[PDB]
Symmetry: C2
Subunit: 844 residues, 2 copies
């Protein structure tokens, strides 16, 4: 019959658009626009057709032939009840068929054991009960209450029980304020008495400068039917979405260490607010990384706490441009399960389906938990002033605990005395103040401490013969591989440096430093835009065959039993990428983790990660991060965005030994700088002003002797054979400007002015600067020289450090570019005239 | 008839997935994976069925019944040739039927007039010819050549010709490096000789410190069959996608000024690279704004220069997580037209469809121009070292101009002599150096210069009876409107302030300042998270009815003929939002344009806009931007992210009078500060350290007399009746710390130490500070006091300004928080101890 074809189009119409008419809002507040396609009359089916049997076809109901009365009911139960599945936009036929099997076979309605139902009720009770307790015990205090979205707690425990049920070993969570204290107490097993002690202010005992209670992270073991599973909740700042990239980098470092090439042992989970996930662009930057080979973690389960309001903003036309906040997920074709949070069984049922999807297909999946915010944005705020109707409806809306208990009683699946005792047993458990999570376990088996002082001794030396054999292996590539003539010219030059015929350039000394690290079995993860070859054609860590596209990585082939070596050409992001590498370095300190800006000027698109994480995470959260940032830097006439890494900004952020700001000027210096970062037992961030023109400067060279038997020099004394008595002025400087100073002093045959580099600006190396200055007893004045404008660079932030170094009688003077609004002139002509001007002011 | 249902599923398979098998790559380089659904056998159609006639259904070919062999030919011609249409993900049925009509009715192959074909050939000729000329005249110089994507120039001229053809009046373009120099010369009408002089370095005659040649913008009139259309190409920095939000704010200010409610008179256009559009999150932030009220511009035409490489990265698994760089567009259900760039008629056909779609449905549309990059990422780079196979293929790939010329000749629509002469006539036109755009026209009639010095006089005073009458109208609301009792309590307090019963609070003086600005007919646009009510429950510019949802905006109801007033609750973005307000303010200087951070700590997620636009756009591009940034600031024990607007960073960025950094401490000061921003003839950015606790501080109050008859004070002298001779120490300070200093000095019964506010830190008000210091001839030492840690705040950047101020005998000292990695402690208890310590260190002598 033609009607059998019409039944088939109706079935797909619900699969495409049934979620648009689904009962997803707990409050029932605003009606959904009608969709004609969901009505059989749109397909010319009438009541006479409704009594006739039909064939389901692809509808996976488990009965080949059905009356239309049950087919129409099955479609509404599957696609228009509590669950709104948005998945047909996906192009993979196997994945869409897979989701149809999960939903359509059960006809939407899920089945759980009565013990499973009693667990969801107790988990709702713990969520509501902890929040009503804090509002009584600490009225008015800022706790970002979960109330109205209490199903997030049973959804989360069901995720973790389901992770161990399918063999996952670790779960890493990154989230925001909403439900944060409920997570700490009711899933991660933080003791309630310790939460009560923080509200009273009696928590103490640290020189961590600290952070507010709803930014804290936690760790615990958590019993699951598959056994104990490690749990980790990240620290995060107030900035709303940026923790998500950091958690992605942590789990990748975990998956890399464990040899989990399919991310099936470590489950990442991120929790988002509905307004934050739509407005913040780092969400899309992270979705773009979800399958990038250098950042993929096997897929993330993403849960949105969609309380249909963001602070005081509730109009959909003010927050976003689409019907759902989750539509950003369609960029990577993620299935999206909207679910009513007043239907806990639907929440757990969609939660298992979402996890099963992520593990079957190793792809991101999103759970839209549609709910409400019972109170104001925080408990001191009045929501009626801006959402009067939403809170007149919430004020007469019963809690999800009460609602679910009413359903189990109607179905004779529970009795009211059991539901009542859970409310009171939980309140008594909070009064005792001990852990209230049944499933919590003490962690099973942390040293070595990596907070040691920057001037701690380290093994700078390396075997000179081992260093040359490493260099020879780097120059070797398969004979069949054919290099571009410029790359083989470069490896031919590296072959001469290994023979002693030519002093090493910057790239060889950098490559050698990586080689000694993997030679000792330590990991190297490099990341950046065009980091394999290098923006300035200097690295060439990856060699591409000129016949086929095949690559060969000499640093990955040094010897068997080497530490792993990876260098990824990153995606066009700096915010999410630098946050990813921050989470990688903190989770796995032992190796070298290095991010490379293509120019240091672009690093400011990750300014939140620099401000709220790198420079401040130790004082705030006791986190040590060894991440190294290569920021190309130097004034060469290329204009405002290709001159300044904003060195002045990193120096301004320096305090309390939080960071290292280094400006190497020699290939040997960058070699020792990189090894000290791994070799020295300190893991604090290394901000590097990477050279550009110095990669090929003829005077910027170092012998093999300088690497094997040298050390990193925080300050470098005068190098030419000046007589110390003859000096009348000492010029402090950093970076390439020294090389312009040196050649001009030699061209003048000037021996009355010494030049002293300060390779490490923070922490300031006091005695190394004084030691370089000591021989010049006749000195009368000192000069700070810099290519950079005076309102930028090291001048404003490092004046007191230089002044403390110099003898008391002498005064210090400035020589450099004038202060300016823009980092650099746009014209090359004006730049060279400025360069000659400042170089002459310093030497006269 | 069972095969008839199978034919319909085959037709929809191509509508859904034909683009996966389309020939989109000019190079033919990498084969695409088979989609099973596109071949009939998958649907049990065999050759015997191919001879039978079938019903096309909704297939819009213009014939209801067709043999299957010709339905299959029509489907491959429509969805598997040069055009790859991705639109079935959209949920609006009408928009899908609209696209099917355009595409299926021409059966893939579209028809153009012979003049239109000769125009696309000449426009391809100018695109190739200009770049080969620059490579000949200036070998090795960095010009980001369009070559391989030459189809872009005819596509752009067809976008503009079709805009005026349908009555649009302005077109505003924002783009990147790729094809930038070709855009200026061959679309915008920049003189080639001025471009050649910039390559030679002979450009001069400006105090703009300037920028590189491929960041410059341009303006022109452009003849179209419907008449002249204004053209505007934005200045942009090197940061790749950030210009896009700025262009959205520029056309929105244009649509607002023109009374264009639906943006049908001003067309926004954005051009993107394949790697940047996938990696940068500001792209998704702007897509989220496309239908937000208060940022919607009626839809943007977005063009991707998809040359399948970004610098040295060409592997898809390293650049993105999806098959197409454009898949982010699906977040807003934008249709996406992939098109092979070696088929200019396909490019022009899809370009007309994209504009017609954007004007019919006022929604974003994307044109994916699939092409190649003929040279390296720039002309000094070697691309073979990292993409050997792509450049062995490009090295033997003929240019789009030659390829199109071969097609017009093979079809006898053109002759080889006509195509040859275009190549040579164009090279001669470039040698002469005059404008080469035939459609270019001189602009028709920019004089109230707004770069005047910050100390320029302005009309600070306002009539006091009008100021009180403005306040009475602000307190009036409709009888049917019902306020929440806290809001009615607040307007009753404002009703008391208008009568003189009570001094004005911070919110009343701020609202009053807005009222005087709209009262004189000037525009006010405020934007920021929860900016309607205010994060701190102080503004309440929008009044929500407690019975229905209706709003009432008292500032929009001052009197008829007032300037428009708008206050928008922004999206949860700061980067794309602050870039949008930068483009609004720069395009429309005359009014007040204000962005409000929810806390000043959150502005650093828009740090690129602050660095590359706000702090540097005047020296780089001669752009005046009057935008005001409200950044809440102040140490109150709320922690590292709720204390510091990073004042030290803005002070570090101050040079060459680029910005204003102000810390008002009185309700009257913010009133005069806001009016000075519009009433004074200067349009430079205003960075404001907004108070938090001062909004309710009993001592932070001002009389109506201070607003009507006062003025903004860059520095505020001692307010208490101290005798100058008895003073022994002067304490400089700004912001709320003054009130902690003042209240402590009164509790101590101390008359030996004066306290002087410095409301404007940059540009530094020298003589006003010296004037405040003059009476204290007996002073022995000076102190800068600040809540901030010593490495933050004003200490490092303003030391020389204070030291040059003080009398020669005296020396300057510091009193404030110790330097720290974090902006603020996480514990309230600790906060107080530090506050009492620094306040006591300043007052003890
Ligand atoms: C990056 C960033 N910008 C601004 C803020 C200030 N802020 C904190 S919470 C909030 C609203 C959050 O709305 P939503 O995402 O829906 O989360 P909810 O609290 O409603 O659960 C805003 C704008 C922030 N914390 N982070
Ligand atoms: C925000 C930002 N990050 C980094 C850079 C440095 N950069 C300039 S061009 C480029 C590659 C651009 O690739 P694509 O988007 O495809 O544009 P194309 O030049 O190939 O057309 C990079 C990483 C930049 N200009 N802006
Ligand atoms: Ca961003
Ligand atoms: Mg919310
Ligand atoms: Mg590209």
């Amino acid at each position: 019959d033609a009607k059998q074809v019409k039944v088939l189009q109706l079935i797909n119409a619900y699969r495409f658009r049934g979620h648009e008419a689904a009962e997803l809002d707990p409050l029932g507040l605003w009606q959904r626009p009608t969709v004609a396609e969901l009505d059989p009359a749109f397909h010319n089916l009438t009541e006479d057709d409704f009594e006739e049997t039909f064939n389901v076809g692809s509808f996976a109901v488990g009965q080949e032939t059905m009356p239309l009365k049950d087919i129409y009911t099955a479609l509404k139960k599957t696609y228009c009840g509590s669950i709104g599945a948005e998945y047909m936009h996906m192009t993979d036929t196997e994945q869409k068929r897979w989701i149809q099997q999960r939903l359509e076979s059960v006809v939407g309605q899920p089945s759980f054991d009565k013990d499973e139902k009693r667990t969801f009720l107790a988990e709702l009770t713990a969520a509501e009960g902890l929040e009503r307790y804090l509002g009584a015990k600490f009225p008015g205090a800022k706790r970002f209450s979960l109330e109205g979205g209490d199903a997030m707690i049973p959804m989360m425990k069901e995720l973790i029980r389901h992770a161990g049920r399918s063999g996952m070993r670790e779960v890493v969570i990154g989230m925001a304020h909403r439900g944060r204290l409920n997570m700490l107490v009711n899933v991660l097993g933080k003791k309630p008495q310790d939460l009560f002690d923080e509200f009273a202010g009696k928590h103490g005992e640290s020189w961590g400068t600290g952070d507010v209670k709803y930014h804290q992270g936690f760790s615990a073991d958590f019993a699951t039917p598959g056994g104990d599973v490690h749990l980790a909740l990240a620290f995060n700042p107030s900035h709303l979405e940026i923790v998500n990239p950091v958690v992605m980098g942590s789990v990748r470092a975990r998956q890399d260490r464990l040899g989990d090439d399919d991310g099936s042992k470590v489950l990442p989970i991120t929790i988002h607010g509905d307004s934050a996930i739509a407005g913040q662009g780092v969400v899309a930057e992270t979705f773009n990384m979800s399958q990038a080979r250098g950042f993929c973690v096997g897929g993330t389960v993403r849960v949105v706490v969609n309380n249909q309001v963001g602070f005081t903003t509730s109009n959909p036309r003010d927050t976003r441009s689409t019907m759902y906040c989750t539509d950003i997920a369609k960029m990577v074709q993620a299935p999206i399960f909207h679910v009513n949070a007043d239907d806990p069984e639907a929440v757990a049922f969609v939660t298992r389906i979402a996890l099963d999807y992520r593990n079957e297909f190793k792809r991101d999946v999103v759970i839209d938990l549609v709910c409400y915010r019972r109170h104001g944005h925080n408990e001191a705020d009045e929501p009626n002033a801006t959402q009067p109707l939403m809170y007149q409806k919430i004020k007469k809306h019963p809690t999800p605990r009460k609602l679910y208990a009413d359903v189990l009683i109607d179905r004779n699946e529970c009795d009211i005395e059991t539901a009542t005792q859970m409310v009171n047993e939980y309140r008594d458990a909070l009064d005792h103040g001990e852990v209230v999570v049944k499933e919590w376990r003490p962690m099973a088996l942390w040293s070595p401490y990596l907070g040691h002082e920057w001037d701690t001794p380290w093994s700078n030396t390396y075997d000179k013969q081992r260093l040359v054999e490493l260099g020879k292996r780097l120059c070797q590539y398969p004979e069949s591989h054919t290099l571009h003539s410029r790359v083989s010219k470069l490896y031919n030059d590296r072959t001469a440096m290994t023979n002693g015929e030519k002093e090493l350039d910057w790239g060889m000394a950098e490559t050698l430093a990586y080689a000694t690290l993997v030679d000792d079995g330590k990991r190297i993860r490099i990341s950046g835009q065009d980091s394999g070859r290098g923006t300035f054609f200097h690295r060439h860590a990856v060699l591409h065959n000129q016949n086929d596209a095949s690559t060969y990585v000499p640093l990955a082939n040094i010897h068997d039993k080497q530490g792993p070596f990876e260098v990824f050409d990153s995606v066009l992001s700096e915010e999410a990428v630098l946050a990813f590498e921050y989470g990688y370095a903190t989770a796995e300190p032992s190796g070298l983790t290095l991010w490379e800006a293509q120019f240091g000027d672009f690093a400011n698109g990750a300014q939140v990660v620099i401000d709220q994480f790198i420079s401040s995470g130790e004082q705030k959260w006791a986190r040590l991060c060894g991440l190294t940032m290569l920021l190309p830097h130097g004034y060469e006439g290329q204009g405002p965005e290709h001159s300044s890494a904003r060195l002045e900004r990193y120096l301004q952020l320096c305090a309390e030994q939080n960071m290292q700001v280094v400006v190497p000027s020699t290939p040997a210096q960058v070699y020792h700088m990189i090894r000290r970062q791994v070799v020295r037992p300190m893991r604090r961030p290394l901000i590097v002003m990477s050279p550009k023109s110095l990669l090929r400067h003829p005077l910027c060279t170092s012998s093999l002797d300088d690497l094997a038997n040298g050390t990193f020099m925080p300050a470098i004394p005068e190098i030419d054979e000046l007589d110390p008595a003859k000096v009348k002025r000492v010029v402090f400087c950093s970076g390439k400007v020294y090389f312009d100073l040196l050649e001009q002093r030699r061209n003048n045959e000037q021996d009355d002015v010494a030049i002293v580099r300060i390779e490490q600006l923070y922490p300031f190396p006091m005695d190394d600067v004084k030691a370089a200055i000591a021989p010049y007893v006749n000195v009368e004045d000192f000069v700070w020289c810099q290519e950079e404008p005076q309102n930028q660079g090291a001048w404003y932030c490092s004046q007191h450090n230089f002044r403390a170094a110099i003898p008391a009688g002498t005064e210090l003077k400035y020589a450099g570019r004038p202060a300016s609004a823009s980092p650099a002139v746009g014209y090359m002509s004006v730049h060279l005239k400025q360069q000659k001007a400042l170089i002459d002011d310093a030497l006269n």
